[PDB]
Write a protein that binds this ligand. Structure first.
Ligand SMILES: CNC(=O)c1nc(C)n2ccc(Nc3nccc(-n4cc(CN(C)C)cn4)n3)cc12
Length: 267
């Protein structure tokens, strides 16, 4: 869990930055050296994220090397060189439809594992997916993540905070209730963003106007070039009723079959 600071080499230029803090590129001496992504600061929220990540073991989840306490608290991760999914698709609009299906199905696989593990992500969005290659996606940013209690299928938040409302299910807004089903809702928004090549959902709308629109039964339209079947799944993830909304096991199966169907059609 705890890493030796002298084994860590940090690069001067910041790889990434945001309201969360900063991301720096580094090297961790393990016989070989390991290229790492280091998240810098709050201490309770960083240790809590590390505690969640330590318990996770999946190919479609960013791996935590460990934590380091120096000048600031550091979350040391395995490097995904291509960065955030939304920023990548924005910079590469020539990425084929099949490649978008491949990447969102990988996210559904990591989320399926996360659901089986009774963990709620609570910040599933394209900005929080990282690319190892153009054909390899991993879920990151576990700072709002909660291990569900043995007796409950949801996490109840005690009062409001800094929340990405455009990704949140109506029950998250109306009852402060976060489940794997509510992560399914965020995933539908994530699908929309990927098929819109990193475009922001609910363009020019306030958080409250988005709540008003969803309550009326209105949903985001089909992105240009997005297949019928993927927009149907998007709308299914956007089922207002938590009970009738599918879980990741069913969302991953629809994506898995659709991907192989596109793969077959290709050759
Ligand atoms: C905000 N900008 C970036 O993160 C970023 N920008 C560029 C150009 N990158 C290149 C590689 C990379 N790798 C990489 N690997 C493993 C983990 C991470 N984490 C990044 C976050 C932060 N979260 C909001 C996304 C959490 N983990 N990041 C990241 C970035």
């Amino acid at each position: 869990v705890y890493l030796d600071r002298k084994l860590l080499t940090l690069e001067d230029k910041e790889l990434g930055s945001g309201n969360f803090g900063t991301v720096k590129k580094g090297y961790y001496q393990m016989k070989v050296v390991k290229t790492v992504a280091v998240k810098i600061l709050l201490k309770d929220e960083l240790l809590a994220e590390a505690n969640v990540m330590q318990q996770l073991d999946n190919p479609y989840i960013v791996r935590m090397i460990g934590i380091c306490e120096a000048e600031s608290w550091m979350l040391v991760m395995e490097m995904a060189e291509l960065g955030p999914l939304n920023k990548y698709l924005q910079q590469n609009r020539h990425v084929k439809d099949k490649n978008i299906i491949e990447l969102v199905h990988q996210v559904s696989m990591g989320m399926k594992y996360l659901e089986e593990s009774n963990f709620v992500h609570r910040d599933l969005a394209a900005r929080n997916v990282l690319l190892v290659t153009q054909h390899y996606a991993k879920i990151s940013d576990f700072g709002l993540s909660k291990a569900l209690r043995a007796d409950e299928n949801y996490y109840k938040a005690q009062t409001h905070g800094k929340w990405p409302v455009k990704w949140y299910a109506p029950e998250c807004i109306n009852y402060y209730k976060f489940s794997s089903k509510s992560d399914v809702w965020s995933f539908g928004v994530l699908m929309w963003e990927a098929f819109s090549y990193g475009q922001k959902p609910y363009r020019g709308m306030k958080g409250s106007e988005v709540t008003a629109m969803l309550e009326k039964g209105e949903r985001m339209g089909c992105p240009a070039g997005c297949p019928r079947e993927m927009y149907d799944l998007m709308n299914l993830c956007w089922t207002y009723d938590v009970e009738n909304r599918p879980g990741f096991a069913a969302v991953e199966l629809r994506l898995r079959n659709y991907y192989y169907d596109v793969v077959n059609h290709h050759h």
